[PDB]
Nucleic acid binder design. Sequence first.
DNA 1: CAGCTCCCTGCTGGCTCCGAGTGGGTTCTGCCGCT
Lengths: 117, 50, 48, 1132, 50, 90, 67
Amino acid sequence: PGFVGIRFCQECNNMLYPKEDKENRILLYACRNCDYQQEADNSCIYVNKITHEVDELTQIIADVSQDPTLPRTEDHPCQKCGHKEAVFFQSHSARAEDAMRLYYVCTAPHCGHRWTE
Amino acid sequence: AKQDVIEVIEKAHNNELEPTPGNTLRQTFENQVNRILNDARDKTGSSAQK
Amino acid sequence: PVPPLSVRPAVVMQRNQDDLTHKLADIVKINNQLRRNEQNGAAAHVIA
Amino acid sequence: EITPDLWQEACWIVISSYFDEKGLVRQQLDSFDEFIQMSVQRIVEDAPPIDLQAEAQHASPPRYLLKFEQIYLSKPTHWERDGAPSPMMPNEARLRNLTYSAPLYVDITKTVIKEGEEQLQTQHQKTFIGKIPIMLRSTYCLLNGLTDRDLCELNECPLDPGGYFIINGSEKVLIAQEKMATNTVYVFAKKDSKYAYTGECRSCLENSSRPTSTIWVSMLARAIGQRIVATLPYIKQEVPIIIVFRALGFVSDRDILEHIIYDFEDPEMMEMVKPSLDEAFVIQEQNVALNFIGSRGAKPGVTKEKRIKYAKEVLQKEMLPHVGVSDFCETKKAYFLGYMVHRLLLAALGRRELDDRDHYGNKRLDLAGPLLAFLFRGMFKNLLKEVRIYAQKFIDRGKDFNLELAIKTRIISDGLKYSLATGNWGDQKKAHQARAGVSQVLNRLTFASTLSHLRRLNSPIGRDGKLAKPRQLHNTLWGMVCPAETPEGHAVGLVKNLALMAYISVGSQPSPILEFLEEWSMENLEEISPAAIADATKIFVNGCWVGIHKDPEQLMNTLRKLRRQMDIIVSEVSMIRDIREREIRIYTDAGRICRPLLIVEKQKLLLKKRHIDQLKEREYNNYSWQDLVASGVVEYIDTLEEETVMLAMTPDDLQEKEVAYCSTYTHCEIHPSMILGVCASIIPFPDHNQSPRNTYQSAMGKQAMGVYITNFHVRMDTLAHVLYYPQKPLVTTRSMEYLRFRELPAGINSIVAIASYTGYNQEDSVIMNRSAVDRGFFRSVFYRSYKEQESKGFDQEEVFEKPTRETCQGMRHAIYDKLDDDGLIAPGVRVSGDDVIIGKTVTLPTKRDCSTFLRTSETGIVDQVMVTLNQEGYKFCKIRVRSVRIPQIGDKFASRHGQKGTCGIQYRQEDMPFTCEGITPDIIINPHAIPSRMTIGHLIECLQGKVSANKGEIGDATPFNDAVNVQKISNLLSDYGYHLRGNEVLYNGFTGRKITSQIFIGPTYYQRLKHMVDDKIHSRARGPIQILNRQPMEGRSRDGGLRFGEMERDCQIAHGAAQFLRERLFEASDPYQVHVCNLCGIMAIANTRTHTYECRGCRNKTQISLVRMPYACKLLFQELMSMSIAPRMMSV
Amino acid sequence: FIKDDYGPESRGFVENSYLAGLTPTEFFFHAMGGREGLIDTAVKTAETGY
Amino acid sequence: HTTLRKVTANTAIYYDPNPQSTVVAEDQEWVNVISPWLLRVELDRKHMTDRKLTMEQIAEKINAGFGDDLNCIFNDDNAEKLVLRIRIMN
Amino acid sequence: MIIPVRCFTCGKIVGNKWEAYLGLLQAEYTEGDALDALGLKRYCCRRMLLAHVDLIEKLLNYAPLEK
DNA sequence: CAGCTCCCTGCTGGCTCCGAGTGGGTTCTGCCGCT
Ligand SMILES: [Zn+2]
Ligand SMILES: [Zn+2]
Ligand SMILES: [Zn+2]
Ligand SMILES: [Zn+2]
């Protein structure tokens, strides 16, 4: 599936819009301001994840480790550096359908590793 | 009762807690916690009257 | 119809007139002014 | 070194240092001082100069500037054209009903050019603008820094906290007013609306004349779906945000998206931002977007270039003032607006969560300083816009003008005096529009009541509302607002007092923080491109996005390091780092509520044995709380910074090696008992009570009678209540010595026996000892003061004299011999109801009296009589009357746990039960008041009181002491020869047989409330009558009648007592007879003496009916007839 | 309390009685709980009488 | 009440020049087989077998609601993936 | 204000004990030793001095109404 | 058969309501000026 991303006109820096080159029967992205065309490489226009199975690990950032108010446990070590102490917390995200699952962030900065158990 | 609440929290964290049908994970965890706390309060009260 | 003194009593030196009496005074002022204008001036603009 | 197991004294020593260096009205004093120091200066200087021309020509015009600055303020002065002016004592102002105000002065420079290119500027120094009311014990008050001996010499109370205004000789206290914080973005989601999410940021410049210009950025709630609109001030309709950006100056689309989505690799943001992008692909340049905005404006321009200018002005000044109003601030406004849109998208995607309205981090407190600033700014603008009118009226003719006559000194002083005296906060014309309740009359019944009224917040949301969410106690009220103390009426949770160590920030300029920030490694918005803005962190200063920093860490540490040494950042400034969301915010504005907290490193406090020692020897080493703050030991933490910090209740119990809970603490609390307020800090063992009991005790602590102030004899005041023998409680909290409750207590340590003796205390009532009352138990004296001033017309001159019967016409049956020939009573004369006190007569164009009569059923004695001159130079008299109130049955008594009750019976010592000794309880309360109320604190107080009275020590009832409990108290009591649980074997006072059950008895601190029964009892039997409708008057003082209300009417209907209902509503209120024609149901004209009954409009004169009617019914019919309605009442 | 603490002490459960007294957290939570009932008592009247 | 949001995991649209081309590798369309712009929605087995529906029922609901303005091409209830493709007829 | 003449509960004279109590506290005596040095055996009489605040001294710091 | 008429449905803006009593207190009932 993946996600479609907006990319912009090199002439006037505006949003491209999908179009069909009827003669070649091939997808073209067309700027409605200027006559620029470009051939699309993804062949996908719009994707909408209704189940919204989201990997919260991408939205988790490393500097959360130095938060004084987050709980800390040495039971679960980091996987790359094997650091003993780890910081864990819940989703902290709205529309988390059913998730009490803990997300862990490794201390000993410059590691910044994030995993889920 | 506190140990039971802690182990229920552990089961919820390790995804070992199955949501009650007709309820989501959050409300079923809330229901378990409330049941444990209410049972503890009732038992302590009954011990008091005894 | 102008209500009588019982409906709009006036107290003495707090004489102090009633809130409705003041509005009635404004009514009679503007009615007399409109009347006299409509016979003498008849401008048909200030009358509106 | 580290201090173990000495915490119970070290923490209270540092608390004592805090309450010595800072008082209890410190927020009031600091706000007013900062106002009169700098905010008045900035308000008077930022006003633009006025330039004024003639009427554009004279024959077939030059102007001037008149700019002024450098305000001057002098100390209060009092006398006018009768002697050389002298300073106003505050007590003199109270006595003479003056306004304790201070004159403020400015120097003006009017520079005028006429012709020939010759400029002359004349400067007028010390120009008088008005007199500003001034707060007592302020930095320019005449009582500032005076010693206690000097205060006593000035007849002032050394214990008086100050913080209030004296206006017309009446104490006024500016209640702090809550409001939503400014310059901050809030994303909300209202339930039922066309749009789902909405992001608002109400914005204000640094105290500018413009009000809060609130801008909403909203998202529709479902084609295409989810368009983003932004309703704008002075714009009738919502405007899509992309049109707003194009009007702001961004022609392209990539540039606009660079200001909203900071990382282009996130396609979920793009999928929701493109529905708003494709809405506005018809506007491509700045001018068409300006035209689009101008068409939607409130004042639509007729031509294109007028809408262009109007919308440009709106974008330049109305939208987002706090981020800057200058020639080129478009990039900064675009960055902040794109941040607002990004914040809205984060809430829409669920990456973040909706901001809470009740979170008192999002609230600000408007104290005396900010409130007086807001009101003085408006009055000053009004003054300028009349100086301008006077200048125009003289320069149209062009002769000359005088600024001394131009300046109307009345407006500023009279506006301040009216606003503070009445409470209508605004211009007098908009009395109904302006919010009321501000600047209440100071409650001066108890010292605790005065402190509570001087430390009080207010939520300006509508009362009688069914939305309980604002009223609820929010989690962020910990340690800054008293959880227990709140009124029980329709103001539950809306009126909330202030915690003990809770301090309200006073505000300072953020500019030094700005120059400090701009020199480490951060970049302003104009310097960088949005390429590197996603990985770094956004810095906010007072809510305006200042710049971007790559390293949040070691800048947070740097800011904390400076704040802990007070190098550049002052202590009140709060720095907040949001970590999961990259913002890092710095707040400097006024109104931030904060409390001091200890600093905790790895797991150890920075408070040390050396700090405690050098601060314990205070008054010689002068190591005060300010030095403790400078040592970097404590910080002031507000709610924003309290979210991002980790506290420990007790260092000993929460910083030790054990099964680890946090091991990463950042701060520790000095003592948890400081979360309470003033009235709730006098409750012994408040954690052993049900919370509604504590709330009721916090409410009744303001009503307990005692020595409310030391100088109560010089204080000529109405409704003054003092107790004969106040006592400090035998069991007390460690927080009372800071409320000075042991110096001005309200109550007596009574020996209560919680038993059912006879049944006269059954329903929450109480038995009192008649012999103790005879000995002076809870005996008090009631002071009521009467004022009068002579004057008012050309010949109707008021005068004080003895009214003489043959001369004066109107007189009561009251005896006037008690008056002296000057028209007053000499102090020390017995007086009673309907006795003349001030003989005042007005000349009759012989004479008619306006003498003041003593309030009916008072029956007191005149204490003292003072005569003086008011500010109009007329004779002014105030008379104070003593009346002692011996505790009788029905007088409302209460304890320190919300156990109120009226005396049910008073038995003598013989009739009262007694111990093995002769100890008879002063008070007997029903045991059936404990089990449902669950005031276990009351029982523990009654136990500890006996323990203390036997040991010789004063009992300690600190809430969270944990060093004293029921078992220890019982073991201590068992050593003194008493049953360990406080029970004793009382004997029956009548029969002498010992009571089969053993009685719980001991000393407990009861209070006597102001609600005596002699001040509530009244009856009526055809007394005075109202004037409009002839029904009985209302009120105890006016000898009024009780209201047989609509529910009592319904109850009588349910009883089916129709004759009783008619008797109540017709004969017992207003029997009346009217004459009505039989043909038309219209009221006729009756001339009873000649028996001529005629109804005009019918010409009958013969068939006329008399009908008996309530006067209210007749007057309703007359009102209906005045409304052209014709209620016709035919008796057939 | 540490972030995301669903334990009984962190969410309002008071394991102490009125005799042992309330730890400051429990005291604040009990005050906040009783505030709800106090607010309800005042708010309910303006609806019930109507 | 059940809408088709309750049962689908995600929805995506493509530009397949030829329905025979099958830009997405699906042998079911190969064996099953006029507009190039098509529609694709992925359901989940969980709600599908919770509410006891079929691709045939969903397709006949679509055909009844919208008529013969579009043709649904649904994968059989044998593969792990739950696909139905939507075109628009001319 | 001032010490009551008699104990409210007992009625034992306490009015003469206040100055002596303060004098004893102006020594090594504690409150518990001063009270029973004055002869206060019952806690009803003991609290009369133990919890008394003597506000007449603060009242006397103000200049009188006359001279 | 295409165009015009009419009746229904749907949606938005507007008006009125918001416990019973009771005790106190307070300020306020225009000001400038110009004949
Ligand atoms: Zn282009
Ligand atoms: Zn690691
Ligand atoms: Zn008639
Ligand atoms: Zn005694």
